[PDB]
Structures are given as structure tokens and as C-alpha cells.
Coordinates of C-alpha atoms in Angstrom, one line a residue:
Chain A
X1163 CA -5.1 -13.8 -11.6
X1164 CA -1.3 -13.2 -12.3
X1165 CA 1.3 -12.9 -10.0
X1166 CA 4.5 -11.2 -11.5
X1167 CA 7.2 -12.0 -9.1
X1168 CA 10.3 -9.6 -9.1
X1169 CA 13.2 -11.5 -7.7
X1170 CA 17.0 -11.5 -8.0
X1171 CA 18.7 -13.9 -10.3
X1172 CA 19.4 -17.2 -8.6
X1173 CA 17.9 -16.2 -5.2
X1174 CA 15.2 -18.9 -5.6
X1175 CA 16.2 -22.4 -6.5
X1176 CA 13.8 -24.1 -8.5
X1177 CA 12.2 -25.9 -5.1
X1178 CA 11.9 -22.4 -3.8
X1179 CA 10.3 -21.1 -6.8
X1180 CA 8.1 -24.0 -6.6
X1181 CA 7.4 -23.3 -3.0
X1182 CA 6.8 -19.9 -3.5
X1183 CA 4.2 -20.3 -6.5
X1184 CA 2.4 -23.0 -4.5
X1185 CA 2.4 -20.5 -1.6
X1186 CA 0.8 -17.8 -3.8
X1187 CA -1.4 -20.3 -5.4
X1188 CA -2.7 -21.8 -2.4
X1189 CA -3.4 -18.2 -0.7
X1190 CA -5.4 -17.2 -3.8
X1191 CA -7.5 -20.6 -3.6
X1192 CA -8.3 -20.9 0.1
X1193 CA -9.7 -17.2 0.6
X1194 CA -11.5 -16.6 -2.6
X1195 CA -12.0 -20.0 -4.3
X1196 CA -10.3 -19.3 -7.4
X1197 CA -9.6 -22.9 -8.7
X1198 CA -6.1 -24.0 -8.7
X1199 CA -5.5 -24.0 -12.6
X1200 CA -6.8 -20.2 -12.8
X1201 CA -3.7 -18.8 -10.7
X1202 CA -0.5 -18.0 -12.8
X1203 CA 2.9 -17.3 -11.0
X1204 CA 5.4 -15.6 -13.5
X1205 CA 8.9 -15.1 -12.0
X1206 CA 10.9 -12.2 -13.4
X1207 CA 14.5 -12.5 -12.7
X1208 CA 17.1 -9.7 -12.7
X1209 CA 20.7 -9.5 -11.7
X1210 CA 21.4 -8.5 -8.0
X1211 CA 21.9 -4.7 -7.8
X1212 CA 18.8 -3.9 -10.1
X1213 CA 16.8 -3.0 -7.1
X1214 CA 17.2 0.5 -5.3
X1215 CA 15.4 1.7 -2.2
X1216 CA 15.5 5.4 -1.4
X1217 CA 18.3 5.6 -3.9
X1218 CA 20.6 2.7 -2.3
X1219 CA 21.3 -0.3 -4.3
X1220 CA 20.2 -3.5 -3.0
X1221 CA 21.7 -6.8 -2.7
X1222 CA 19.4 -9.8 -4.0
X1223 CA 16.7 -10.3 -1.0
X1224 CA 13.9 -8.0 -1.9
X1225 CA 10.7 -9.5 -3.6
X1226 CA 8.0 -7.6 -5.2
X1227 CA 4.6 -9.3 -5.9
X1228 CA 2.5 -7.6 -8.4
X1229 CA -0.8 -9.6 -8.4
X1230 CA -3.3 -8.7 -11.2
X1231 CA -6.9 -9.6 -10.3
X1232 CA -10.3 -8.8 -11.6
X1233 CA -12.3 -6.2 -9.8
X1234 CA -15.2 -7.3 -7.6
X1235 CA -13.6 -8.7 -4.5
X1236 CA -14.1 -6.7 -1.0
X1237 CA -11.1 -4.7 0.5
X1238 CA -11.0 -7.2 3.4
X1239 CA -10.7 -10.1 1.4
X1240 CA -7.9 -8.3 -0.7
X1241 CA -6.3 -7.4 2.5
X1242 CA -6.3 -10.6 3.9
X1243 CA -5.0 -12.1 0.6
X1244 CA -2.1 -9.6 0.6
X1245 CA -1.2 -10.3 3.9
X1246 CA -1.4 -14.2 3.3
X1247 CA 1.1 -13.6 0.4
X1248 CA 3.7 -12.0 2.5
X1249 CA 3.4 -14.3 5.2
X1250 CA 3.3 -17.7 3.2
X1251 CA 6.1 -16.2 0.7
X1252 CA 8.2 -15.3 3.8
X1253 CA 8.4 -19.1 4.8
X1254 CA 8.8 -20.6 1.4
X1255 CA 11.7 -18.3 0.4
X1256 CA 13.4 -18.2 3.6
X1257 CA 13.2 -14.5 3.5
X1258 CA 12.5 -11.8 6.2
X1259 CA 8.7 -10.1 5.7
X1260 CA 10.4 -6.7 5.6
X1261 CA 12.0 -7.6 2.2
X1262 CA 8.3 -8.4 0.6
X1263 CA 6.4 -5.9 -1.3
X1264 CA 2.8 -6.8 -2.4
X1265 CA 0.8 -4.8 -4.8
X1266 CA -2.7 -5.7 -6.1
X1267 CA -4.1 -4.0 -9.3
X1268 CA -7.7 -5.0 -10.4
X1269 CA -9.3 -4.6 -13.9
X1270 CA -12.8 -5.5 -15.3
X1271 CA -13.3 -9.0 -16.2
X1272 CA -14.8 -8.2 -19.6
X1273 CA -10.8 -7.1 -20.8
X1274 CA -9.2 -10.0 -19.1
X1275 CA -8.4 -13.4 -21.1
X1276 CA -7.1 -16.4 -19.6
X1277 CA -6.2 -19.6 -21.6
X1278 CA -7.5 -17.7 -24.5
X1279 CA -11.3 -17.2 -22.8
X1280 CA -12.9 -14.2 -21.1
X1281 CA -13.0 -14.1 -17.6
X1282 CA -16.5 -14.4 -16.1
Chain B
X1119 CA 5.8 3.5 -4.5
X1120 CA 7.7 1.3 -7.1
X1121 CA 9.0 2.3 -10.0
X1122 CA 9.7 -0.4 -12.7
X1123 CA 12.1 1.1 -15.0
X1124 CA 12.6 -1.1 -18.3
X1125 CA 15.8 -0.5 -20.1
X1126 CA 18.3 -2.6 -22.6
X1127 CA 20.8 -4.6 -21.0
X1128 CA 24.1 -2.5 -20.4
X1129 CA 22.4 0.9 -21.6
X1130 CA 22.9 2.1 -18.0
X1131 CA 26.1 1.6 -16.1
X1132 CA 25.8 1.1 -12.4
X1133 CA 26.4 4.9 -11.9
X1134 CA 23.7 5.4 -14.4
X1135 CA 21.2 3.4 -12.8
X1136 CA 22.2 5.0 -9.5
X1137 CA 21.7 8.3 -11.0
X1138 CA 18.3 7.3 -12.4
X1139 CA 17.2 5.4 -9.5
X1140 CA 18.0 8.9 -7.4
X1141 CA 16.5 11.1 -9.8
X1142 CA 13.2 9.1 -9.7
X1143 CA 13.2 8.9 -5.8
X1144 CA 14.2 12.7 -5.4
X1145 CA 11.3 13.6 -7.9
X1146 CA 8.7 11.5 -5.9
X1147 CA 9.6 13.0 -2.4
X1148 CA 10.4 16.3 -3.6
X1149 CA 6.6 16.7 -4.7
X1150 CA 4.7 14.6 -2.4
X1151 CA 6.8 14.1 0.7
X1152 CA 7.0 10.2 0.6
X1153 CA 10.1 9.3 2.3
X1154 CA 12.9 8.2 0.7
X1155 CA 13.1 4.5 2.1
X1156 CA 9.5 4.1 0.5
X1157 CA 10.6 4.5 -3.1
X1158 CA 11.6 1.4 -4.9
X1159 CA 13.3 1.7 -8.1
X1160 CA 13.4 -1.8 -9.9
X1161 CA 15.2 -2.2 -13.2
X1162 CA 14.1 -4.6 -15.6
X1163 CA 16.9 -5.2 -18.2
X1164 CA 16.3 -6.9 -21.5
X1165 CA 18.7 -7.4 -24.8
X1166 CA 18.3 -4.8 -27.1
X1167 CA 16.0 -5.3 -29.9
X1168 CA 13.0 -6.5 -27.4
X1169 CA 11.4 -3.2 -28.0
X1170 CA 9.1 -2.6 -30.8
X1171 CA 7.7 1.0 -31.9
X1172 CA 4.7 1.0 -34.5
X1173 CA 6.2 -2.5 -35.5
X1174 CA 9.8 -1.4 -36.1
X1175 CA 12.6 -2.9 -34.1
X1176 CA 14.5 -0.4 -31.9
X1177 CA 17.9 -0.2 -30.6
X1178 CA 18.9 0.2 -26.8
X1179 CA 18.0 3.7 -26.3
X1180 CA 14.0 3.6 -25.0
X1181 CA 13.6 3.7 -21.4
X1182 CA 9.7 3.0 -20.1
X1183 CA 9.0 3.8 -16.4
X1184 CA 6.0 2.3 -14.7
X1185 CA 5.1 4.0 -11.5
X1186 CA 3.0 2.3 -9.2
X1187 CA 1.4 4.5 -6.6
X1188 CA -1.0 4.7 -4.0
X1189 CA -4.5 6.2 -4.8
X1190 CA -5.2 9.8 -3.6
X1191 CA -3.0 12.5 -5.2
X1192 CA -4.3 15.1 -7.2
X1193 CA -4.1 14.9 -10.9
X1194 CA -2.0 18.0 -11.0
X1195 CA 0.6 16.7 -8.5
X1196 CA 0.8 13.3 -10.6
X1197 CA 1.3 15.3 -13.9
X1198 CA 4.0 17.4 -12.3
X1199 CA 5.6 14.3 -10.9
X1200 CA 5.5 12.5 -14.3
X1201 CA 7.1 15.6 -16.1
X1202 CA 9.8 15.7 -13.7
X1203 CA 10.6 12.2 -14.0
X1204 CA 10.9 12.4 -17.8
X1205 CA 13.2 15.7 -17.2
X1206 CA 15.5 14.2 -14.4
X1207 CA 16.0 10.7 -15.9
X1208 CA 16.5 12.4 -19.3
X1209 CA 19.6 14.2 -17.8
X1210 CA 20.8 11.3 -15.4
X1211 CA 20.7 8.8 -18.4
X1212 CA 21.8 11.5 -20.7
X1213 CA 19.2 10.3 -23.0
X1214 CA 16.9 12.3 -25.3
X1215 CA 13.5 12.9 -23.6
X1216 CA 11.6 11.7 -27.0
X1217 CA 13.2 7.9 -25.5
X1218 CA 11.4 8.4 -22.2
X1219 CA 7.8 6.9 -21.7
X1220 CA 6.3 7.4 -18.2
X1221 CA 3.0 5.7 -16.8
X1222 CA 1.3 5.8 -13.5
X1223 CA -0.9 3.2 -12.1
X1224 CA -2.8 3.5 -8.7
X1225 CA -4.4 1.2 -6.4
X1226 CA -6.1 1.5 -2.8
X1227 CA -3.4 1.7 0.1
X1228 CA -5.5 -1.1 1.4
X1229 CA -4.3 -3.4 -1.1
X1230 CA -0.6 -2.3 -1.2
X1231 CA 2.0 -4.0 1.4
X1232 CA 5.5 -2.5 1.6
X1233 CA 8.6 -3.9 3.9
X1234 CA 5.7 -6.2 5.0
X1235 CA 3.4 -3.7 6.4
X1236 CA 0.2 -2.1 4.8
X1237 CA 0.3 1.2 3.4
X1238 CA -1.3 4.4 4.9
Chain C
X422 CA 0.1 2.2 -25.5
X423 CA 2.5 -0.3 -24.0
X424 CA 2.2 -3.9 -24.4
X425 CA 4.4 -5.6 -22.2
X426 CA 4.8 -9.3 -23.6
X427 CA 6.1 -12.1 -21.2
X428 CA 7.7 -15.0 -23.0
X429 CA 10.1 -17.6 -22.4
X430 CA 13.8 -16.9 -23.7
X431 CA 14.0 -18.0 -27.4
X432 CA 10.6 -19.3 -27.7
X433 CA 10.2 -16.3 -30.3
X434 CA 12.8 -16.1 -33.1
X435 CA 13.6 -12.2 -34.1
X436 CA 11.2 -12.7 -37.2
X437 CA 8.5 -13.9 -34.7
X438 CA 9.0 -11.1 -32.3
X439 CA 8.5 -8.8 -35.4
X440 CA 5.2 -10.6 -36.6
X441 CA 3.8 -10.5 -32.9
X442 CA 4.6 -6.4 -32.2
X443 CA 3.4 -6.2 -35.9
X444 CA 0.0 -8.4 -35.2
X445 CA -0.4 -6.3 -31.5
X446 CA 0.3 -2.9 -33.3
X447 CA -2.1 -3.8 -36.2
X448 CA -4.7 -4.9 -33.7
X449 CA -4.6 -1.7 -31.8
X450 CA -4.9 0.9 -34.8
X451 CA -7.2 -1.3 -36.7
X452 CA -9.8 -1.4 -34.2
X453 CA -9.5 1.9 -32.3
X454 CA -7.6 4.4 -34.8
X455 CA -4.3 4.6 -32.5
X456 CA -1.6 5.8 -34.7
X457 CA 1.2 3.4 -35.9
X458 CA 4.1 5.2 -33.9
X459 CA 2.1 5.0 -30.6
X460 CA 2.4 1.6 -30.2
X461 CA 5.1 0.1 -28.1
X462 CA 5.6 -3.8 -27.8
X463 CA 8.1 -4.3 -25.1
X464 CA 9.2 -8.2 -25.0
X465 CA 9.9 -9.5 -21.3
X466 CA 12.0 -12.7 -21.8
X467 CA 12.5 -15.1 -19.2
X468 CA 14.1 -18.7 -18.9
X469 CA 11.5 -21.3 -19.5
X470 CA 10.5 -23.0 -16.3
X471 CA 9.9 -19.4 -14.6
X472 CA 5.9 -19.9 -15.3
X473 CA 3.9 -21.7 -12.7
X474 CA 0.3 -22.5 -13.3
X475 CA -2.0 -23.8 -10.5
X476 CA 1.6 -24.5 -9.0
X477 CA 2.9 -26.5 -11.9
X478 CA 6.1 -25.4 -13.3
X479 CA 5.6 -24.7 -17.3
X480 CA 7.6 -25.2 -20.2
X481 CA 8.5 -22.3 -22.6
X482 CA 4.8 -21.9 -24.4
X483 CA 3.1 -19.4 -22.2
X484 CA 2.3 -15.9 -23.6
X485 CA 0.8 -13.3 -21.2
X486 CA 0.2 -9.9 -22.7
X487 CA -0.3 -7.1 -20.3
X488 CA -1.6 -3.9 -22.3
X489 CA -1.6 -0.5 -20.7
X490 CA -4.1 1.8 -22.1
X491 CA -5.3 5.3 -21.8
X492 CA -9.1 5.3 -20.2
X493 CA -12.1 6.1 -22.2
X494 CA -12.7 3.2 -24.5
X495 CA -15.9 1.3 -24.4
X496 CA -16.0 -2.4 -23.0
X497 CA -17.2 -3.6 -26.4
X498 CA -13.9 -2.2 -28.1
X499 CA -11.5 -3.4 -25.1
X500 CA -12.9 -7.0 -25.4
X501 CA -13.0 -6.8 -28.9
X502 CA -9.0 -5.6 -29.0
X503 CA -8.3 -8.2 -26.4
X504 CA -9.7 -11.0 -28.4
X505 CA -8.0 -9.7 -31.6
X506 CA -4.8 -10.0 -29.9
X507 CA -5.5 -13.5 -28.9
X508 CA -6.1 -14.4 -32.2
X509 CA -3.3 -12.4 -34.1
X510 CA -0.8 -13.5 -31.7
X511 CA -1.9 -17.1 -31.9
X512 CA -1.1 -16.9 -35.6
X513 CA 2.2 -14.9 -35.5
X514 CA 3.6 -17.0 -32.9
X515 CA 2.1 -20.2 -34.2
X516 CA 1.1 -20.9 -30.7
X517 CA -2.3 -22.6 -29.2
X518 CA -4.6 -19.9 -28.2
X519 CA -4.9 -21.7 -24.7
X520 CA -1.3 -20.6 -24.1
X521 CA -2.2 -16.7 -24.4
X522 CA -3.2 -14.6 -21.6
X523 CA -4.1 -10.8 -22.2
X524 CA -4.9 -8.3 -19.6
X525 CA -5.7 -4.5 -20.0
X526 CA -5.0 -2.1 -17.6
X527 CA -6.2 1.7 -18.1
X528 CA -4.8 5.3 -16.5
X529 CA -6.1 8.6 -17.0
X530 CA -4.1 10.2 -20.1
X531 CA -3.0 12.8 -17.8
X532 CA -0.7 10.7 -16.0
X533 CA 0.6 8.8 -19.2
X534 CA 3.6 10.4 -21.0
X535 CA 4.7 8.8 -24.4
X536 CA 7.8 10.3 -26.3
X537 CA 8.4 12.4 -23.4
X538 CA 4.9 14.3 -24.0
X539 CA 1.6 13.9 -22.3
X540 CA -1.2 11.9 -24.1
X541 CA -4.4 13.5 -25.4

């Protein structure tokens, strides 16, 4: 899987980025068994002020996680994984859970390529 | 919902970003009744020249809106909402509608978390 | 279609970006018939160090291609296109295939607008 993590520039220090990536990676392995080396966390930084909520410009605290998964997991597992990411990213980033959004999209494994190989 | 808005750096001034975010937020609530605070507009700026169309490098005028939605709306409502975003973003950014692309993706509410809470 | 191409800043020279964009555009048309002008390649650059794999911070070599397509192609064509993108991006960027990830998402044409008009 690939987790696109949308954050404001400099909101996360290198060690906070590492903590967040580890927290997402460990969530994605503890619950599903997805091996460590399969989890990509890709931080997309933008200047603070580029996020609007209800048309109101935000500071730099919002985090949006868009997880891109292969189809086939149960709704229970996906809901548990999403909640685990909220909780563990909240801790690793020192950010209130209310600032964290997490969406999971899914695709057939047959149209997903990782490390230049098709997914099982 | 989350609207990822892919624009060139400095193509939108702070007031143009606010107008675009308002136009997208107002389209969404005016057609589905999603509360204001539920609409995130997330601007992703890149240097001009990073967009290619048919392999031809573009200037800074392209706008691509990727809307990430809960499943369950009718094809008619989604089409109306996409068309409204084209029109109102065209006005708010004073940019030809031919430069505006809008795709909607959908996911089960059960794998979507906003403000650290699951969606209905 | 829109291909979002996530790369590290300055990993691709302007001529390498053009080559990658051409390679993706040519894959898309040569396999499906998608007309030249219909293919948008949108490069999203981030500082090297913003990609983590298995929690390990990466250099600037990863490439992730997120293709956004209209529904309706066969699984065979989609897999052929993804494999073709891996191969031709590998050459055009002179980058090991093992650094290239390619995911395809699909949506109904009825909720996709290109050049300010709805898709067939």
C-alpha cells in the first residue's frame, strides 16, 4: 500500500516524519500482516494556508492521510486500520485527533504494481 | 469530502484561493446539504511546467480538482456537482473552463474518517 | 486520464520530465486508443527524504504513478498498460524498475470532466 500524507511544510520534523511513517507502517502490518517492506509513506508538504475547511483558511495543523490499498479486506479490518492510524499518528505527530482525516481507497491487485512487480 | 486542487505555484493569490475554496464548498453544500465544516479544500501547488498534456509542457493555467467523496449519491447529483465546480471555479479563478478538470472518487463511509471520527 | 507522478525535487530534469510524460502518454494511446490530448501527466515534486518504505527514509529515487482512469477497460488491458508504464518510465527516467510503483484507479465517466466537459 501507499499512504499519501498531506501536511503543512515544516509541521513535522524529520524525526516526527519518521515516527509518523513508522506508526502508519506498524498499523498496516499488525492488523493485516502486510510485510514491513510493502508500506510506502509519501509525505506531500505544502505551505501553511493551503488548507481550507468550510471555506476558512487553516493554519498548519491539518493532516490528511489517503491510503491506497488493494481490494479484498473486510470492512471491519479497514475500519480498525483507519482508526489505528488516527490514534497512532495523533501520538507520533503530537497533533489532536480532530485535525486528522484518513480515507482508504481500494483497487484490484491486478492494476497495482509495487517495486515494478504486480501485487498478488 | 476532500477536494485536492492541483494548481501551479502563485497562479492563485490568497484571495483567489479563498474564492476557489468557497466556490467548491458552496457547490457541495448547495447540492447535497453536506455541512460547511465537512468540506476540506486542499491546494497542492507545483512549479509551472510540471503539467504535460499530450506530452506537451503547459504553462501555469491548468487546474485539476480531485474530489474524494462518500459513496451513495446518484449519478445525476454527482454530475451536477462536477459541472457546478467547473463553472464556479472558472469564475472564482477567472480562468477558461477548458483549463479545468474535475474527477470524483468515492469510497464507503466506513473507511473514511474526518475530524478523527467515522463518517455516516 | 490523469497520471499523478510523485517524484523527488530535481530528480527529473526538464527533458527527463518530458520523456516520462511522453512515455506515459504514448503507452496510454498505443494500448487503448486514448487520443493524444486526453492524457494529462501532472508531476508532484517533494524534497528527497519525504518517502519512507517500511519506515525507512528513502533517497530521491522513488517514483509513484497514480493513474486516474474512466471505468470500462478489461483487466488485461489495464495490466498491460501498467506494465508498459513501468518499462517505459524506467527507460525515460533511467531508473531501476524496482523504484517504480504504478496504481490505477477508475471512476464512472459520468463523474469525470476534462477540458471543462464530461467524458464519453
